[PDB]
Structure 1
Amino acid sequence: HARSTGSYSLVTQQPLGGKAQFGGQRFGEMEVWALEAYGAAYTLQEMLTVKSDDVNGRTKMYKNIVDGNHQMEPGMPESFNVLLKEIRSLGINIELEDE
């Protein structure tokens, strides 16, 4: 099985399962720990932001690859926004300050 681009889940904009919905492999906590043991900070960032969650990130990267430019923008993952909204639904106030 192999995938480059496909469909994404509804609640969290992430790839689907395996070989049934034409989905991608899963990058787990052990793999994250291995990449942290390595010095591949850029690889980890492009793994957990552009290829998975950043809605504008993935399309921008696709357009840059088609145009021949190997560069990316990190953006912000949708999963963290979903988590923030879920926490704000309780009686807990969490926010990001700019300074």
Structure 2
Amino acid sequence: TVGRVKVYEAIVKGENIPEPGIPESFKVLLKELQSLCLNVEVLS
């Protein structure tokens, strides 16, 4: 829901259609697995 807006704006402005720098469905699960005292480290 935070990407479709960026996309509509990009297109109407004529700029390169963006790309999610790091996947986005992951963050709530990341939080709630960290909240359970399980260290998680998005690597790179």
Q: Aligned equivalents of 1:70 and 1:97: distance in 2? A: 27
- How many pairs align? 43
Q: In 1, distance between residues paired with 2:20 and 2:43?
A: 19
TM-score normalised by the chain length of structure 2: 0.60
In 2, Cα distance between equivalents of 1:91 and 1:67: 44
1:29-87 per-residue CA deviation (whole Å, 9 max, x = no partner) reads: xxxxxxxxxxxxxxxxxxxxxxxx5x2x332211112124562322331x311000000
Counterpart of 1:63 in structure 2 is 9
Q: Structure 2 CA distance, aligned partners of 1:68 and 1:97?
A: 33
Give the CA RMSD over aligned residues: 2.2
Runs of 5+ unmatched residues, structure 1 = 1-52
Q: Distance in 2 between matches of 1:72 and 1:91?
A: 34
Q: Residue in 1 aligned with 2:31? A: 85
User: What does residue 97 of structure 1 align with?
Assistant: 43
What is the TM-score with the length of structure 1 in the denominator?
0.34
Q: State the distance in 1 between where 2:14 and 2:37 align.
A: 48
Which structure dedicates a bigger proportion of its chain to strand? 1
